[PDB]
């Protein structure tokens, strides 16, 4: 049969989560306050669109049944979305097929225009990404596939280039759903007509002016400051179609503010020989006494994030984000996973340092990992099966999929080492 | 006597550098092209100053400003050449250090990279590492500009999002000490930097024309003068510094030439991260990575890799794990020297040595003859590195810049560098390790 189907039909993936949601205080957004805010933004956009089109059709209406609207209203204390959620399935399909009505630069990149300084340009930064708006007024971050070879980007160092960038965003969401972490925004691949769906729908004159026709008769747009800095500066359709990743927008920071928190294990340190850094508990013994890691949930949430990052080989989680409303102990949002799935033949166990030093793990997390190590629910099999739904299938080649099984075994062997040293009662925390 | 004096009187610190400078093509700026550009900026600044002083109703007292060629910062810019930012035993640098330390200010503003983050507050672009928020760019009476980084004052209880062991407590001391070590090592690759106790009321608030910077000044409940950053405050990170009640200590770093006159490139550091190799070969000892980097442009040419190895030695000595990128001048091409900017993350742990920073040296096993000779000399008792550093730092207004543990760690890390070179020589011989210069 189907291992992916077997996984979500398994009793483990149907256990109700504790504590059950108590309605109001457990949801991110207040429905009535958020809906009137979205209705004002829609009226704003229709006002902008009416004046623009007159300078050169019926208006847009905010429909409550839109996928992204239910997505935002579905965000609660237990994660970004629900397990086996039909709303998520519809949102993935909507992002893949709905036409676009507007396109612009990301807000953080409108600043670097520019006034070109290569310091703020060669920072994990995807400078050719764009924000697309769909016909249902939803917004997604479009990260195009890396196309230029490093000979065209003299400043870029080969082994730091995000060649797998768009595949990594897609595969990180599917792994998030399979792990039942439910902490990264829904993400799909899409083959985009850059002429029809970007150039002809944007109101940004700067973005209009950077589009050009390649000498090879392809349609392209470029970034001026990255070109002068000799980094990645252009992507092209062939001649119109360009594949990339689309990541669903979280609610506006006006509705749900977010904090950025530094990852205390982003760096490893060479301890005085020959005690290894990932195995020595002194560092986590100190972090356990430092707010906000003194409470159990926060440290266990970071350990979840390190397991996720180890599985995808992401060494670039310098910071994690949280929603203000859920306070401490709230779940961590796993955003911007474009640096994952870059090295299938190398495992950076220093990423697992929170688990190997603190020697504690969620019971739920360990049970899901133990199940995904069994042949009937093999992580690489259910991942390969899940990624077949995407327009850019297979998204992940076989080496990356098989590396998931190897890194999963390493996580489980690490837990065994903790249990030998401290016993199951100390290691496996309950909720 | 004086060990610092003995060091620069030593024959090693008086060897002419090869190849000798050929004047024009070896200088960064063309004097006549650069001087007329500065004269236009001065005329621009005088136009704004007359017009501004009228909008806020202030009598246009005092005569206008004149671009004087003999200004320290002007000669500094014209002195930049293919061999470094400044000359060895340079009286121009000594004067520039004194001018930054004593000259009054005439204008103050935000840095351009932070004028962008005045939004639209997003904590992602605010809590990034290596970022020094609340820093300001000051303009002096001789029209020169310096980056003022104020001392970190708030404890981590006031910054709940900040992780204790990542806080830049030594931030202003690190910028100062990194320049003094740069001069003592004769790398001459970081901009001149001094400490200064600044009256934030007279020399920042009362000279700025930026209304946003004006509005963020306030009086502390303890009757201190303070200014704050709104977006960092909402992000629960470091957001305010204060005089006590007016005076605030910080670091001042001299501006490089405008990117219009001398464009710069930022290049990623291939050794910014270490990796756990499949057992049981250690990362710092395995040469395969550098064997591959040696085949990757622009590290195939000898000068570039040797310059990176110099930068790793420097970063190891000051314990800076945050050199994600290095900068170069466009005009000097690939073989040009590397600029060692933004050293605020150094000198943070006197009791730990991160040998992974030395990885380029321990993997590639090659070093400049000049670099190795200077290190060997600074390890001798008569020229002891901690002694000449302590002596050099006494010139600064914020003396002592480095406490004794940091100074003694310089000697300990120097021994590790030289003992690392010994390991390379055992494996490959002096001929392979010690490279000579063209
Ligand atoms: C991508 O979109 C462009 C523009 O909508 C399409 O090119 C147009 O094709 C029609 C005929 O089908 C012509 O009348 C237009 O003049 C064309 N415009 C341009 C700018 O060439 C293109 O066919 C689309 N490619 C797809 C859908 O694969
Ligand atoms: C973790 O530490 C924080 C702060 O140190 C605790 O939060 C508050 O701490 C102060 C004193 O440190 C108390 O007066 C408050 O009552 C605490 N807030 C509460 C209890 O909500 C926090 O409680 C610590 N974690 C745990 C599990 O106690
Ligand atoms: C720092 O600058 C302030 C502002 O110029 C100086 O304070 C001024 O001088 C005297 C001292 O209080 C007062 O009569 C003025 O009214 C002050 N002006 C303002 C705006 O407060 C101060 O003396 C300077 N030096 C120190 C050490 O604070
Ligand atoms: C380094 O490699 C580049 C490859 O483009 C070549 O042009 C250059 O001449 C090489 N220089 C040296 C010194 O090997």
Residue numbers in the entry:
A (entry chain A): 89 to 144, 150 to 216, 218 to 525
B (entry chain B): 89 to 526
Q: What does the literature reporting this entry say, word for word?
A:
We have previously demonstrated that Fam20A lacks an essential residue for catalysis and is therefore the first pseudokinase identified in the secretory pathway. Fam20A forms a functional complex with Fam20C and allosterically increases Fam20C activity towards secretory substrates, including the enamel matrix proteins, whose phosphorylation is critical for enamel formation. Furthermore, Fam20A binds ATP despite being catalytically inactive, the structural basis and functional impact of which remain elusive. Here, we report the nucleotide-free and ATP-bound crystal structures of Fam20A.
We determined the crystal structure of human Fam20A at 2.5 Å resolution. As a result of the upswing of this loop, Gln258Fam20A is dislodged from the ‘active site’ of Fam20A. Instead, Cys209Fam20A and Cys211Fam20A in the Kβ1-Kβ2 loop form two disulfide bonds with Cys319Fam20A and Cys323Fam20A (the two Cys that align with Cys273ceFam20 and Cys277ceFam20), respectively. In the crystal, Fam20A forms a symmetrical, face-to-face dimer.
